[PDB]
Amino acid sequence: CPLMVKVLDAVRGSPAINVAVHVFRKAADDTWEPFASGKTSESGELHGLTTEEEFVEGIYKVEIDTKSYWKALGISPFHEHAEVVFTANDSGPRRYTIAALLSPHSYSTTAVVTN
Amino acid sequence: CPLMVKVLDAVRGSPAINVAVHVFRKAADDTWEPFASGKTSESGELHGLTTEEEFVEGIYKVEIDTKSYWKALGISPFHEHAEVVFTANDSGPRRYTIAALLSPHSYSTTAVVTNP
Amino acid sequence: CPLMVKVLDAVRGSPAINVAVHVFRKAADDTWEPFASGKTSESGELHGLTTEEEFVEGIYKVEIDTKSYWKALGISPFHEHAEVVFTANDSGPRRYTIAALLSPHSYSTTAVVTN
Amino acid sequence: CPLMVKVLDAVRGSPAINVAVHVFRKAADDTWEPFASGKTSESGELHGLTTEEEFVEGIYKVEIDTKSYWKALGISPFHEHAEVVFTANDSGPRRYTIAALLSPHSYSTTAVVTNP
């Protein structure tokens, strides 16, 4: 898959499991429209979000429902969710891995782009 | 100052200067309405975005224009911007400091919440 | 393997490859002694550092030669290296993954402990 | 103040108070020699660790006792401490700010280097 998502819990030191993830693509009128979604596996990963044919150039937004994740663990969260917005470009073969590291009042997100 | 934003450059190890910042508040119709904007100073900090009187309860979005920052220095970043969304003042007024650490392909954001 | 290491470059957005990694164990006299070492693969990972029998409880230090990594890319680094010190405990099955995200003047390290 | 250390709590979103900090300088025999120590205040900052006159060239180690911090609040952390090692003043005197963001199983450290 050209687009992969991996979430980690910095508090417990483990993958963040069963975390809802929504992907959106920016439409011609600048509104966001559903593209893909799913929940992280037991490894904190979410694969098979899309395919090469479907994944065309453009601006994409990846939304991670961190709020629910924390509520579920009985921990008070600051953010409503963790957003990641980027432009997918066909500069040769490219796989996109959006890595997110979570804490109740802080999160880190990194993009690993490999060929 | 109830809402402050601080940005650092992780590559250079210095304050990220002139970083444009846009704040939005979710309207009673679920669309993002402009609330305030500014640019970081030489210390990488942005003060005076709003006031206690005007900073009411609500869901806020702090948009840091990271892309313009990196492009402004010959670098082609991954993210379009960094957006921090959170509910504020739902337990009474608080002072919020939104910190962001920037790298071309990665960013970190922390929120420091204290009382007045 | 009970101990794994993964390094990412936050500047280029890819795994940090061919990065030297040294593991040490704290001896009875508090000095650090060689335990294991290697260089990250093309995936930015370093496996097979040790085995269950060898990996006993105690205090371990994982040293990542980030300085060389940056020098090699013609980029000026701040830190001499990135250290990670922790206590390995036999609280039931445990695999240790030390994740490091690198930037010239900043680094993040997370420990993913799974069963 | 040529060397300052700031620590934040990523779980709570507040300054990490009373965090013990030990600084060492590599001696001409490759062993770590005590240079200075202190604890973070209520703002999570530690000032006055050393002076311009005493902070000479060298390889320094800043040891932040994260474990004691987390244990002091009923939490069993992963790391023993966070150690920041770096060469300082090799291009003339600079002001260094070592920042650290703490979580029970993870930490981030950034170095801000500026001129006087």
From Swiss-Prot, chains A, C:
Result for mutant: S41I: In AMYLD1; amyloid cardiomyopathy
Impact reported for F24V: In AMYLD1; amyloid polyneuropathy
Substitution effect: V11I: In AMYLD1; late-onset amyloid polyneuropathy with carpal tunnel syndrome
PTM characteristics: Not glycosylated under normal conditions. Following unfolding, caused for example by variant AMYLD1 'Gly-38', the cryptic Asn-89 site is exposed and glycosylated by STT3B-containing OST complex, leading to its degradation by the ER-associated degradation (ERAD) pathway. Sulfonation of the reactive cysteine Cys-1 enhances the stability of the native conformation of TTR, avoiding misassembly of the protein leading to amyloid formation.
Result, substituting E33G: In AMYLD1; amyloid polyneuropathy
Further comment: Tetramer dissociation and partial unfolding leads to the formation of aggregates and amyloid fibrils. Small molecules that occupy at least one of the thyroid hormone binding sites stabilize the tetramer, and thereby stabilize the native state and protect against misfolding and the formation of amyloid fibrils.
Outcome reported for the amino acid change (mutating I75N): In AMYLD1; vitrous amyloid
Protein's organism: Homo sapiens
Name of the protein this chain belongs to: Transthyretin
Impact noted for substituting V85A: In a patient with amyloidosis
